[PDB]
PDB file of C-alpha atoms and ligand atoms in Angstrom:
ATOM      1  CA  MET A   1       0.000   0.000   0.000  1.00  0.00           C
ATOM      2  CA  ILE A   2       0.968   3.661   0.778  1.00  0.00           C
ATOM      3  CA  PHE A   3      -1.576   5.506   3.146  1.00  0.00           C
ATOM      4  CA  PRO A   4      -2.503   8.948   1.369  1.00  0.00           C
ATOM      5  CA  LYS A   5      -0.678  12.404   0.843  1.00  0.00           C
ATOM      6  CA  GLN A   6       2.910  12.702   2.339  1.00  0.00           C
ATOM      7  CA  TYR A   7       4.345  16.040   3.547  1.00  0.00           C
ATOM      8  CA  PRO A   8       5.547  18.724   1.089  1.00  0.00           C
ATOM      9  CA  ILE A   9       9.330  18.831   0.408  1.00  0.00           C
ATOM     10  CA  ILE A  10      11.271  21.949  -0.536  1.00  0.00           C
ATOM     11  CA  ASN A  11      14.825  21.506  -1.924  1.00  0.00           C
ATOM     12  CA  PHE A  12      17.846  23.781  -1.401  1.00  0.00           C
ATOM     13  CA  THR A  13      21.527  23.335  -2.150  1.00  0.00           C
ATOM     14  CA  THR A  14      24.495  25.265  -0.936  1.00  0.00           C
ATOM     15  CA  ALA A  15      26.408  24.238  -4.069  1.00  0.00           C
ATOM     16  CA  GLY A  16      26.591  27.381  -6.293  1.00  0.00           C
ATOM     17  CA  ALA A  17      23.954  29.090  -4.247  1.00  0.00           C
ATOM     18  CA  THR A  18      23.104  32.656  -4.987  1.00  0.00           C
ATOM     19  CA  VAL A  19      20.942  35.409  -3.462  1.00  0.00           C
ATOM     20  CA  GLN A  20      18.194  34.445  -5.930  1.00  0.00           C
ATOM     21  CA  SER A  21      18.280  30.714  -5.257  1.00  0.00           C
ATOM     22  CA  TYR A  22      18.253  31.261  -1.489  1.00  0.00           C
ATOM     23  CA  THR A  23      15.388  33.789  -1.823  1.00  0.00           C
ATOM     24  CA  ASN A  24      13.417  31.315  -3.890  1.00  0.00           C
ATOM     25  CA  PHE A  25      13.999  28.659  -1.200  1.00  0.00           C
ATOM     26  CA  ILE A  26      12.862  30.835   1.735  1.00  0.00           C
ATOM     27  CA  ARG A  27       9.768  32.114  -0.225  1.00  0.00           C
ATOM     28  CA  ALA A  28       8.868  28.488  -0.908  1.00  0.00           C
ATOM     29  CA  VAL A  29       9.289  27.478   2.770  1.00  0.00           C
ATOM     30  CA  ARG A  30       6.988  30.382   3.826  1.00  0.00           C
ATOM     31  CA  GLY A  31       4.492  29.307   1.176  1.00  0.00           C
ATOM     32  CA  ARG A  32       4.272  25.803   2.681  1.00  0.00           C
ATOM     33  CA  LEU A  33       4.191  26.988   6.262  1.00  0.00           C
ATOM     34  CA  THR A  34       1.146  29.312   5.869  1.00  0.00           C
ATOM     35  CA  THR A  35      -2.212  28.735   4.258  1.00  0.00           C
ATOM     36  CA  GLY A  36      -3.365  32.322   3.644  1.00  0.00           C
ATOM     37  CA  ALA A  37      -6.170  31.805   6.202  1.00  0.00           C
ATOM     38  CA  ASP A  38      -4.731  34.242   8.657  1.00  0.00           C
ATOM     39  CA  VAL A  39      -3.041  37.560   8.008  1.00  0.00           C
ATOM     40  CA  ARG A  40      -2.995  40.376  10.552  1.00  0.00           C
ATOM     41  CA  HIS A  41      -1.587  43.843   9.827  1.00  0.00           C
ATOM     42  CA  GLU A  42      -0.323  42.373   6.559  1.00  0.00           C
ATOM     43  CA  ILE A  43       1.625  39.694   8.498  1.00  0.00           C
ATOM     44  CA  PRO A  44       0.810  36.008   7.973  1.00  0.00           C
ATOM     45  CA  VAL A  45       0.102  33.887  11.022  1.00  0.00           C
ATOM     46  CA  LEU A  46       1.069  30.164  11.168  1.00  0.00           C
ATOM     47  CA  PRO A  47      -1.663  27.528  11.587  1.00  0.00           C
ATOM     48  CA  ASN A  48      -3.146  27.058  14.984  1.00  0.00           C
ATOM     49  CA  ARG A  49      -1.929  23.797  16.591  1.00  0.00           C
ATOM     50  CA  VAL A  50      -5.445  23.294  18.064  1.00  0.00           C
ATOM     51  CA  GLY A  51      -7.383  20.864  15.796  1.00  0.00           C
ATOM     52  CA  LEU A  52      -4.677  20.850  13.107  1.00  0.00           C
ATOM     53  CA  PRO A  53      -4.826  17.487  11.323  1.00  0.00           C
ATOM     54  CA  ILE A  54      -1.640  15.335  11.464  1.00  0.00           C
ATOM     55  CA  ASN A  55      -1.476  15.269   7.627  1.00  0.00           C
ATOM     56  CA  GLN A  56      -0.948  19.021   7.529  1.00  0.00           C
ATOM     57  CA  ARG A  57       1.396  19.264  10.514  1.00  0.00           C
ATOM     58  CA  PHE A  58       4.897  19.133   8.879  1.00  0.00           C
ATOM     59  CA  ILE A  59       7.014  20.205   5.922  1.00  0.00           C
ATOM     60  CA  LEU A  60      10.326  18.681   4.805  1.00  0.00           C
ATOM     61  CA  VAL A  61      13.413  20.612   3.768  1.00  0.00           C
ATOM     62  CA  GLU A  62      15.852  18.585   1.742  1.00  0.00           C
ATOM     63  CA  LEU A  63      19.333  20.145   1.946  1.00  0.00           C
ATOM     64  CA  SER A  64      22.182  19.164  -0.320  1.00  0.00           C
ATOM     65  CA  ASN A  65      25.952  19.871  -0.489  1.00  0.00           C
ATOM     66  CA  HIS A  66      28.712  20.641  -2.984  1.00  0.00           C
ATOM     67  CA  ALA A  67      30.073  17.481  -1.222  1.00  0.00           C
ATOM     68  CA  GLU A  68      27.082  15.611  -2.819  1.00  0.00           C
ATOM     69  CA  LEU A  69      25.501  14.870   0.500  1.00  0.00           C
ATOM     70  CA  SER A  70      21.832  15.337   1.502  1.00  0.00           C
ATOM     71  CA  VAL A  71      19.922  15.589   4.774  1.00  0.00           C
ATOM     72  CA  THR A  72      16.191  16.233   5.266  1.00  0.00           C
ATOM     73  CA  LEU A  73      14.989  18.485   8.032  1.00  0.00           C
ATOM     74  CA  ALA A  74      11.403  18.239   9.353  1.00  0.00           C
ATOM     75  CA  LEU A  75       9.703  21.541  10.331  1.00  0.00           C
ATOM     76  CA  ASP A  76       6.532  21.860  12.406  1.00  0.00           C
ATOM     77  CA  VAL A  77       4.121  24.256  10.579  1.00  0.00           C
ATOM     78  CA  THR A  78       2.765  25.664  13.857  1.00  0.00           C
ATOM     79  CA  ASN A  79       6.048  27.377  14.741  1.00  0.00           C
ATOM     80  CA  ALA A  80       8.575  26.685  11.894  1.00  0.00           C
ATOM     81  CA  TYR A  81      10.659  24.652  14.419  1.00  0.00           C
ATOM     82  CA  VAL A  82      13.137  22.057  13.236  1.00  0.00           C
ATOM     83  CA  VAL A  83      11.952  18.972  15.106  1.00  0.00           C
ATOM     84  CA  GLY A  84      14.395  16.433  13.634  1.00  0.00           C
ATOM     85  CA  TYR A  85      16.138  15.228  10.608  1.00  0.00           C
ATOM     86  CA  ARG A  86      16.934  12.250   8.394  1.00  0.00           C
ATOM     87  CA  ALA A  87      20.339  11.299   6.956  1.00  0.00           C
ATOM     88  CA  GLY A  88      20.049   8.063   4.844  1.00  0.00           C
ATOM     89  CA  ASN A  89      18.954   5.220   7.239  1.00  0.00           C
ATOM     90  CA  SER A  90      18.950   7.151  10.493  1.00  0.00           C
ATOM     91  CA  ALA A  91      16.564   9.814  11.844  1.00  0.00           C
ATOM     92  CA  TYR A  92      17.003  11.906  14.941  1.00  0.00           C
ATOM     93  CA  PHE A  93      14.397  13.959  16.815  1.00  0.00           C
ATOM     94  CA  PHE A  94      14.816  16.503  19.560  1.00  0.00           C
ATOM     95  CA  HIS A  95      13.229  15.651  22.881  1.00  0.00           C
ATOM     96  CA  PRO A  96       9.521  16.486  22.525  1.00  0.00           C
ATOM     97  CA  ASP A  97       7.907  19.171  24.711  1.00  0.00           C
ATOM     98  CA  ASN A  98       4.822  17.060  25.347  1.00  0.00           C
ATOM     99  CA  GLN A  99       2.989  13.807  24.608  1.00  0.00           C
ATOM    100  CA  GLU A 100       0.999  15.137  21.646  1.00  0.00           C
ATOM    101  CA  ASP A 101       4.312  16.215  19.933  1.00  0.00           C
ATOM    102  CA  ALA A 102       5.853  12.792  20.607  1.00  0.00           C
ATOM    103  CA  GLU A 103       2.928  11.135  18.814  1.00  0.00           C
ATOM    104  CA  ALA A 104       3.112  13.598  16.014  1.00  0.00           C
ATOM    105  CA  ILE A 105       6.741  12.914  15.248  1.00  0.00           C
ATOM    106  CA  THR A 106       5.974   9.211  14.789  1.00  0.00           C
ATOM    107  CA  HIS A 107       4.422  10.358  11.520  1.00  0.00           C
ATOM    108  CA  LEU A 108       7.770  11.522  10.165  1.00  0.00           C
ATOM    109  CA  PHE A 109      10.398   9.433   8.273  1.00  0.00           C
ATOM    110  CA  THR A 110       8.251   6.383   8.841  1.00  0.00           C
ATOM    111  CA  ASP A 111      10.419   3.886   6.868  1.00  0.00           C
ATOM    112  CA  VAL A 112      13.870   4.758   8.272  1.00  0.00           C
ATOM    113  CA  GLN A 113      15.584   1.707   9.870  1.00  0.00           C
ATOM    114  CA  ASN A 114      17.068   3.612  12.807  1.00  0.00           C
ATOM    115  CA  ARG A 115      15.022   6.124  14.810  1.00  0.00           C
ATOM    116  CA  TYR A 116      16.379   7.993  17.766  1.00  0.00           C
ATOM    117  CA  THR A 117      15.046  10.645  20.002  1.00  0.00           C
ATOM    118  CA  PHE A 118      17.729  12.757  21.619  1.00  0.00           C
ATOM    119  CA  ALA A 119      17.450  13.107  25.285  1.00  0.00           C
ATOM    120  CA  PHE A 120      17.841  16.965  24.996  1.00  0.00           C
ATOM    121  CA  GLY A 121      15.351  19.448  23.477  1.00  0.00           C
ATOM    122  CA  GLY A 122      16.239  21.532  20.433  1.00  0.00           C
ATOM    123  CA  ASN A 123      15.967  25.139  21.864  1.00  0.00           C
ATOM    124  CA  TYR A 124      18.975  27.494  21.327  1.00  0.00           C
ATOM    125  CA  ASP A 125      19.907  27.524  25.020  1.00  0.00           C
ATOM    126  CA  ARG A 126      20.311  23.729  25.138  1.00  0.00           C
ATOM    127  CA  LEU A 127      22.136  23.665  21.778  1.00  0.00           C
ATOM    128  CA  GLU A 128      24.504  26.457  22.738  1.00  0.00           C
ATOM    129  CA  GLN A 129      25.420  24.512  25.933  1.00  0.00           C
ATOM    130  CA  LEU A 130      26.105  21.396  23.850  1.00  0.00           C
ATOM    131  CA  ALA A 131      28.049  23.360  21.208  1.00  0.00           C
ATOM    132  CA  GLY A 132      30.206  25.086  23.738  1.00  0.00           C
ATOM    133  CA  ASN A 133      29.423  28.296  21.881  1.00  0.00           C
ATOM    134  CA  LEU A 134      26.714  31.001  21.866  1.00  0.00           C
ATOM    135  CA  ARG A 135      24.937  32.063  18.681  1.00  0.00           C
ATOM    136  CA  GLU A 136      26.914  35.299  18.733  1.00  0.00           C
ATOM    137  CA  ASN A 137      30.124  33.292  18.245  1.00  0.00           C
ATOM    138  CA  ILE A 138      28.897  30.931  15.492  1.00  0.00           C
ATOM    139  CA  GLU A 139      29.433  32.130  11.947  1.00  0.00           C
ATOM    140  CA  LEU A 140      26.547  31.846   9.452  1.00  0.00           C
ATOM    141  CA  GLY A 141      26.517  31.924   5.667  1.00  0.00           C
ATOM    142  CA  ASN A 142      26.769  29.518   2.786  1.00  0.00           C
ATOM    143  CA  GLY A 143      30.064  27.957   3.965  1.00  0.00           C
ATOM    144  CA  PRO A 144      28.769  27.233   7.494  1.00  0.00           C
ATOM    145  CA  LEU A 145      25.636  25.738   5.872  1.00  0.00           C
ATOM    146  CA  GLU A 146      27.605  23.472   3.465  1.00  0.00           C
ATOM    147  CA  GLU A 147      29.712  22.286   6.454  1.00  0.00           C
ATOM    148  CA  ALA A 148      26.628  21.826   8.661  1.00  0.00           C
ATOM    149  CA  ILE A 149      24.978  19.588   6.016  1.00  0.00           C
ATOM    150  CA  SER A 150      28.056  17.321   5.980  1.00  0.00           C
ATOM    151  CA  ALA A 151      28.186  17.287   9.823  1.00  0.00           C
ATOM    152  CA  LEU A 152      24.574  16.173  10.119  1.00  0.00           C
ATOM    153  CA  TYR A 153      25.059  13.586   7.417  1.00  0.00           C
ATOM    154  CA  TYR A 154      28.103  11.949   9.179  1.00  0.00           C
ATOM    155  CA  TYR A 155      26.567  11.838  12.722  1.00  0.00           C
ATOM    156  CA  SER A 156      25.376   8.178  12.304  1.00  0.00           C
ATOM    157  CA  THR A 157      28.895   6.943  11.821  1.00  0.00           C
ATOM    158  CA  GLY A 158      30.752   8.699  14.652  1.00  0.00           C
ATOM    159  CA  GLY A 159      32.299  11.264  12.380  1.00  0.00           C
ATOM    160  CA  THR A 160      30.589  14.172  13.987  1.00  0.00           C
ATOM    161  CA  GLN A 161      31.170  15.037  17.630  1.00  0.00           C
ATOM    162  CA  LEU A 162      28.164  16.291  19.692  1.00  0.00           C
ATOM    163  CA  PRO A 163      29.433  19.851  19.974  1.00  0.00           C
ATOM    164  CA  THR A 164      29.768  19.968  16.148  1.00  0.00           C
ATOM    165  CA  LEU A 165      26.281  18.465  15.634  1.00  0.00           C
ATOM    166  CA  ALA A 166      24.679  21.065  18.015  1.00  0.00           C
ATOM    167  CA  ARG A 167      26.567  23.911  16.246  1.00  0.00           C
ATOM    168  CA  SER A 168      25.377  22.551  12.835  1.00  0.00           C
ATOM    169  CA  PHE A 169      21.741  22.604  14.115  1.00  0.00           C
ATOM    170  CA  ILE A 170      22.249  26.198  15.274  1.00  0.00           C
ATOM    171  CA  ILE A 171      23.355  27.117  11.723  1.00  0.00           C
ATOM    172  CA  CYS A 172      20.457  25.322  10.020  1.00  0.00           C
ATOM    173  CA  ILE A 173      17.767  26.703  12.293  1.00  0.00           C
ATOM    174  CA  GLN A 174      18.849  30.325  11.797  1.00  0.00           C
ATOM    175  CA  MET A 175      19.384  30.015   8.040  1.00  0.00           C
ATOM    176  CA  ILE A 176      16.083  28.282   7.393  1.00  0.00           C
ATOM    177  CA  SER A 177      13.517  28.808  10.266  1.00  0.00           C
ATOM    178  CA  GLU A 178      14.647  32.233  11.369  1.00  0.00           C
ATOM    179  CA  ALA A 179      14.974  33.454   7.826  1.00  0.00           C
ATOM    180  CA  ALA A 180      11.448  32.223   7.083  1.00  0.00           C
ATOM    181  CA  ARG A 181      10.164  33.994  10.229  1.00  0.00           C
ATOM    182  CA  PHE A 182      11.931  37.349   9.529  1.00  0.00           C
ATOM    183  CA  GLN A 183      12.609  39.103   6.216  1.00  0.00           C
ATOM    184  CA  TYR A 184      15.236  40.945   8.095  1.00  0.00           C
ATOM    185  CA  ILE A 185      17.153  37.682   8.898  1.00  0.00           C
ATOM    186  CA  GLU A 186      16.574  36.406   5.304  1.00  0.00           C
ATOM    187  CA  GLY A 187      18.232  39.726   4.179  1.00  0.00           C
ATOM    188  CA  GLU A 188      21.208  39.101   6.554  1.00  0.00           C
ATOM    189  CA  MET A 189      21.732  35.666   5.035  1.00  0.00           C
ATOM    190  CA  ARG A 190      21.365  37.084   1.426  1.00  0.00           C
ATOM    191  CA  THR A 191      24.242  39.514   2.226  1.00  0.00           C
ATOM    192  CA  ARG A 192      26.537  36.733   3.450  1.00  0.00           C
ATOM    193  CA  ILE A 193      25.710  34.563   0.355  1.00  0.00           C
ATOM    194  CA  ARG A 194      26.100  37.458  -2.111  1.00  0.00           C
ATOM    195  CA  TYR A 195      29.701  38.192  -0.875  1.00  0.00           C
ATOM    196  CA  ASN A 196      30.490  34.579   0.132  1.00  0.00           C
ATOM    197  CA  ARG A 197      31.577  35.896   3.503  1.00  0.00           C
ATOM    198  CA  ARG A 198      30.617  34.073   6.703  1.00  0.00           C
ATOM    199  CA  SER A 199      29.971  36.031   9.867  1.00  0.00           C
ATOM    200  CA  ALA A 200      28.295  35.583  13.230  1.00  0.00           C
ATOM    201  CA  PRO A 201      24.877  37.186  13.779  1.00  0.00           C
ATOM    202  CA  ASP A 202      24.925  40.721  15.287  1.00  0.00           C
ATOM    203  CA  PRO A 203      22.602  41.874  18.113  1.00  0.00           C
ATOM    204  CA  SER A 204      19.865  42.970  15.638  1.00  0.00           C
ATOM    205  CA  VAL A 205      19.546  39.259  14.541  1.00  0.00           C
ATOM    206  CA  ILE A 206      19.906  37.771  17.969  1.00  0.00           C
ATOM    207  CA  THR A 207      17.307  40.111  19.656  1.00  0.00           C
ATOM    208  CA  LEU A 208      14.789  39.451  16.851  1.00  0.00           C
ATOM    209  CA  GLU A 209      15.245  35.637  17.304  1.00  0.00           C
ATOM    210  CA  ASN A 210      14.860  35.934  21.020  1.00  0.00           C
ATOM    211  CA  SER A 211      11.782  38.108  20.704  1.00  0.00           C
ATOM    212  CA  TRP A 212       9.730  36.204  18.052  1.00  0.00           C
ATOM    213  CA  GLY A 213       7.144  34.808  20.449  1.00  0.00           C
ATOM    214  CA  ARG A 214       6.809  38.094  22.318  1.00  0.00           C
ATOM    215  CA  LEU A 215       6.451  40.093  19.151  1.00  0.00           C
ATOM    216  CA  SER A 216       3.820  37.628  17.843  1.00  0.00           C
ATOM    217  CA  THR A 217       1.821  38.003  20.998  1.00  0.00           C
ATOM    218  CA  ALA A 218       2.245  41.830  21.200  1.00  0.00           C
ATOM    219  CA  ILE A 219       1.002  42.180  17.574  1.00  0.00           C
ATOM    220  CA  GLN A 220      -1.951  39.888  18.087  1.00  0.00           C
ATOM    221  CA  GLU A 221      -2.965  41.583  21.397  1.00  0.00           C
ATOM    222  CA  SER A 222      -2.424  45.102  20.058  1.00  0.00           C
ATOM    223  CA  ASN A 223      -5.057  47.763  19.975  1.00  0.00           C
ATOM    224  CA  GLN A 224      -5.356  48.467  16.214  1.00  0.00           C
ATOM    225  CA  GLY A 225      -1.638  47.833  15.973  1.00  0.00           C
ATOM    226  CA  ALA A 226      -0.546  49.771  19.071  1.00  0.00           C
ATOM    227  CA  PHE A 227       1.336  47.770  21.701  1.00  0.00           C
ATOM    228  CA  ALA A 228       0.231  48.147  25.368  1.00  0.00           C
ATOM    229  CA  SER A 229       3.833  47.695  26.376  1.00  0.00           C
ATOM    230  CA  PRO A 230       6.753  48.466  24.141  1.00  0.00           C
ATOM    231  CA  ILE A 231       9.303  45.782  23.244  1.00  0.00           C
ATOM    232  CA  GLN A 232      12.981  46.579  23.245  1.00  0.00           C
ATOM    233  CA  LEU A 233      15.159  45.225  20.459  1.00  0.00           C
ATOM    234  CA  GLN A 234      18.746  46.037  19.520  1.00  0.00           C
ATOM    235  CA  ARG A 235      20.272  47.622  16.431  1.00  0.00           C
ATOM    236  CA  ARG A 236      23.412  46.180  14.795  1.00  0.00           C
ATOM    237  CA  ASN A 237      25.675  48.255  16.973  1.00  0.00           C
ATOM    238  CA  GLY A 238      23.864  46.932  20.113  1.00  0.00           C
ATOM    239  CA  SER A 239      22.013  50.174  20.915  1.00  0.00           C
ATOM    240  CA  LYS A 240      18.357  49.892  22.066  1.00  0.00           C
ATOM    241  CA  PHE A 241      15.437  50.256  19.604  1.00  0.00           C
ATOM    242  CA  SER A 242      11.907  50.518  21.053  1.00  0.00           C
ATOM    243  CA  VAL A 243       8.965  48.952  19.150  1.00  0.00           C
ATOM    244  CA  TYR A 244       5.613  50.574  19.971  1.00  0.00           C
ATOM    245  CA  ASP A 245       3.522  49.393  16.986  1.00  0.00           C
ATOM    246  CA  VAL A 246       3.194  46.766  14.367  1.00  0.00           C
ATOM    247  CA  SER A 247       3.836  49.258  11.585  1.00  0.00           C
ATOM    248  CA  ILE A 248       7.676  49.307  11.999  1.00  0.00           C
ATOM    249  CA  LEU A 249       7.699  45.438  11.964  1.00  0.00           C
ATOM    250  CA  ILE A 250       5.883  44.958   8.566  1.00  0.00           C
ATOM    251  CA  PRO A 251       9.256  45.019   6.662  1.00  0.00           C
ATOM    252  CA  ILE A 252      10.917  42.873   9.373  1.00  0.00           C
ATOM    253  CA  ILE A 253       8.709  39.942  10.485  1.00  0.00           C
ATOM    254  CA  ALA A 254       7.288  37.614   7.907  1.00  0.00           C
ATOM    255  CA  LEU A 255       5.396  35.065   9.968  1.00  0.00           C
ATOM    256  CA  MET A 256       3.995  34.936  13.511  1.00  0.00           C
ATOM    257  CA  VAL A 257       3.134  31.973  15.791  1.00  0.00           C
ATOM    258  CA  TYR A 258      -0.640  31.752  16.467  1.00  0.00           C
ATOM    259  CA  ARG A 259      -1.339  33.058  19.980  1.00  0.00           C
ATOM    260  CA  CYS A 260      -4.829  34.387  20.270  1.00  0.00           C
ATOM    261  CA  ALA A 261      -7.932  34.357  18.080  1.00  0.00           C
ATOM    262  CA  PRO A 262      -8.198  37.718  15.971  1.00  0.00           C
ATOM    263  CA  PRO A 263     -10.780  40.051  17.447  1.00  0.00           C
ATOM    264  CA  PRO A 264     -13.866  40.944  15.374  1.00  0.00           C
ATOM    265  CA  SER A 265     -13.421  43.448  12.545  1.00  0.00           C
ATOM    266  CA  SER A 266     -10.306  42.437  10.360  1.00  0.00           C
ATOM    267  CA  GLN A 267     -10.422  39.685   7.542  1.00  0.00           C
ATOM    268  CA  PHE A 268     -13.743  40.998   6.123  1.00  0.00           C
TER     269      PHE A 268
HETATM  270  N1  LIG B 301      15.045  23.181  16.791  1.00  0.00           N
HETATM  271  C1  LIG B 301      14.719  24.482  16.872  1.00  0.00           C
HETATM  272  N2  LIG B 301      15.114  25.236  17.884  1.00  0.00           N
HETATM  273  C2  LIG B 301      14.746  26.493  17.971  1.00  0.00           C
HETATM  274  N3  LIG B 301      15.014  27.211  19.063  1.00  0.00           N
HETATM  275  C3  LIG B 301      14.584  28.485  19.139  1.00  0.00           C
HETATM  276  C4  LIG B 301      14.850  29.291  20.385  1.00  0.00           C
HETATM  277  O1  LIG B 301      15.393  28.800  21.382  1.00  0.00           O
HETATM  278  N4  LIG B 301      14.234  30.465  20.522  1.00  0.00           N
HETATM  279  C5  LIG B 301      14.508  31.337  21.712  1.00  0.00           C
HETATM  280  C6  LIG B 301      13.161  31.717  22.285  1.00  0.00           C
HETATM  281  N5  LIG B 301      12.519  32.555  21.288  1.00  0.00           N
HETATM  282  C7  LIG B 301      11.225  32.513  20.919  1.00  0.00           C
HETATM  283  O2  LIG B 301      10.640  33.582  20.737  1.00  0.00           O
HETATM  284  N6  LIG B 301      10.741  31.277  20.778  1.00  0.00           N
HETATM  285  C8  LIG B 301       9.576  30.706  20.315  1.00  0.00           C
HETATM  286  C9  LIG B 301       8.273  31.203  20.574  1.00  0.00           C
HETATM  287  C10 LIG B 301       7.191  30.462  20.077  1.00  0.00           C
HETATM  288  C11 LIG B 301       7.342  29.292  19.336  1.00  0.00           C
HETATM  289  C12 LIG B 301       8.621  28.826  19.083  1.00  0.00           C
HETATM  290  C13 LIG B 301       9.720  29.552  19.600  1.00  0.00           C
HETATM  291  C14 LIG B 301      13.978  29.149  18.046  1.00  0.00           C
HETATM  292  N7  LIG B 301      13.685  28.434  16.954  1.00  0.00           N
HETATM  293  C15 LIG B 301      14.023  27.081  16.855  1.00  0.00           C
HETATM  294  C16 LIG B 301      13.716  26.243  15.760  1.00  0.00           C
HETATM  295  O3  LIG B 301      13.105  26.715  14.778  1.00  0.00           O
HETATM  296  N8  LIG B 301      14.071  24.945  15.774  1.00  0.00           N
END
């Protein structure tokens, strides 16, 4: 047999990548993460986890290498989170947050011979501890990505040490999930690809990543766009930047996590 559907796959390679091919990739990931059901202040909202059928729950990102290697990451559509990956005959999942997530990930990579669930979760704090480095000290760009794809591919066979695996996840998550979430972070990665120059993320990138949930909730709870409480971000040079309203974020955030139902008066 072969029980219906199967999750959408988007392909990207680091080999010969360009600003245009990376832009096409991120646009496609955003297109599979959202449905068009839910747009607030011109900003798409991800599907609500509540009642979402398991057949619509994930997307697959197949990454390949100039080294001719390929790994497939699985992203949860509710939050763009990388929940695990497959490399040939092994799959690995981060420790699930709850029982319902544990069941859901049994629907991924269902014919791999070897399935493992890490005993650690996949949040940045945990991965930074394992990597022995913070995000601010881990270079991003097309070279880091090419190297991360090889690292994930060789984990099975003892080639990749834990610290290097956790660093490689840190690279993938920011270059795929965070770029999908934020046009600003997609733009940061386009710069590094255009000049083929790797560099660690500056405070503007890091404070956006750390603030995604808070900004999603502040936008969704706003009064016609106005925040009850401002949110402080940082500029590139580390100086503070106060956000009072959704308006200044329209060019910056591309997707929000679903927090609250939209109040009457906005998709009519
Ligand atoms: N594996 C993984 N790990 C990740 N870890 C983080 C991370 O710690 N974020 C720091 C906390 N920031 C934040 O507002 N989080 C958030 C809010 C709602 C839903 C998901 C994340 C982000 N993305 C990812 C991700 O996309 N995949």
